[PDB]
Design a binder for these strands. Sequence first.
RNA 1: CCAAGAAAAGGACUGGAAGAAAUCAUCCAAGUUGGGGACUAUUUUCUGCCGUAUAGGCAG
Lengths: 50, 300, 50, 202
Amino acid sequence: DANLKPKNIERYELAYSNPQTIEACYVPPNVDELYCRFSLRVEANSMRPY
Amino acid sequence: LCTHLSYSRSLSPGKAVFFYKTAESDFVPLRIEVAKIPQTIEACYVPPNVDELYCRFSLRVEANSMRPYVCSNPDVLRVMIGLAQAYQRLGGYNELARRYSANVLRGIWLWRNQYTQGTKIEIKTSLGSTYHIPDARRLSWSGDWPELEQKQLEQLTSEMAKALSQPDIFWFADVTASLKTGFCQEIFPSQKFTESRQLATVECSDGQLAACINPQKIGAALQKIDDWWANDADLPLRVHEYGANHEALTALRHPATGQDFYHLLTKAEQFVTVLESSELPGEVHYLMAVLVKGGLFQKG
Amino acid sequence: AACINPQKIGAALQKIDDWWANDADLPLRVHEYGANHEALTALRHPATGQ
Amino acid sequence: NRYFFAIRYLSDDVDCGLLAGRCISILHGFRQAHPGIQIGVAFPEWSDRDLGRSIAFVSTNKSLLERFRERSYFQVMQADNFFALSLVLEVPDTCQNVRFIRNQNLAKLFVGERRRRLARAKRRAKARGEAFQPHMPDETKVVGVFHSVFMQSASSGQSYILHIQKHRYERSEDSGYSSYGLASNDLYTGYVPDLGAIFSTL
RNA sequence: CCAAGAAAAGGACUGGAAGAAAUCAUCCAAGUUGGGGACUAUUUUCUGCCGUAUAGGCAG
């Protein structure tokens, strides 16, 4: 509590876990390489105010 | 202190998968059988005629504790930078590397599956080294290791000491162990957490399932190297800001003692001063270990 | 399938600005006020005239 | 043509699986003293979620059932206010029957059973002289609902579990009960009335 | 021992006829959610037999 009083919590009460639900992503076994792709367009559009 | 302060993790595994070899193909997964009885029962054991089981995982190590991921205070930042370097140049990374390295070679990341007729561990790295522990069943936390084994601990310690302390080195290790097994020995993979029980598996690229151990379950085993409290080494704790001990349901560095991370975090100005006069005390070893297992250190 | 968002790719490509304080350091994402997220601050605060 | 009596557990913290096992053990011991008898076990408080806090016994010979009721264990448990006992009375003629068959096939769901089965199969092949070449089944099975009762071995160093299922009755043949008063899937036919009725008596 | 005390509003009905809201009309410009993690615990399912047999039935 505001780095002042440490809270009343009994010793055993912090040995408990905190469960959570998460999403995650891993490369599956035996894949040799991963690919990533995207496209890019460029326009000469700074010459004049929209 | 300050409002925003974060570190990211400097050491991490991917997951572990169990498999065996045949004369026809090199990777055949160990599978799990389920009966719907929903409310199910299930089992997993090495099948007849397979003499040994393999377990494999990968590890990356990164020199990422030298600098705060985020810091909102220029004075907090100046100090944390000075401290990491004040420590690095006196050594001490060797000590941390020695402790981490010892755990990989010992094999405790196998948890409940250590009880074999003989376990062999082999390690390869991205710098071209190979290490070989012919039998992992005899190496203690405390004690002198037998010859030729003590030596590989030193060599591995050196590669990792660098991986932890100098940037732009891309260091990977590939750890495979072999379990020589019993007639139809039961295997203990990670369990599923639910709101009867279920076991965890992964999918193969061909659609088969396999038994596995979760990433953080491998990780929890590796980082268990905290024995700096109460001048009584016993066995080490998993590094935790409060010194939690799950087996006894207690906490060794309870805030009431002044021995936790947060009290210690505020004395950095004093530690740097000492390091300059330098011997490294338990208080700075603890702090460095926590910075390596980075997380949120905020709302000061 | 897993992806990376358009503007997340974009923020990386346009990370080009080391023209402040006559000391290049690392470049910032172009921003009218010179925002710096990592340090939670701003390098071209209106108070500077920059 | 049928008589019964019932026992209920008074304590709210009673463990049904542990305690039920003792009543069966007594029945067995009695069966050993007088081999030519037939007494069936029923669970009038059976549920899909639990086993229930009560047990009943059913038979055809009034005078014999009285002798069973007089067994010292039951008398002690009543005296200390653990058990509520009923008297022996006639079974109502307006009810339906159930089997209470036990299923040993469920043993095969556990690793210990598979290990034993294969060890014997390997050894058994030596007589044939062929190489040991076992062949495993597929990954999915479907089973019905069952409850467990905790059991001690007879004059040995072991303990194990009984797995009980409840089947509805269909009438044929002639009867017999197993040593535990339970029914078997085959060649052990018997039944008990499902006396979930008139349970307000305890 | 209440501005005291007592009180039957009842009967009967038939609001119907007609009808045309239409014409047009432009929402546009840029924009980074993000850093950490043990579901296994003081738990019950162990030992034999029939059988070509991880089929299918039985004794503890």
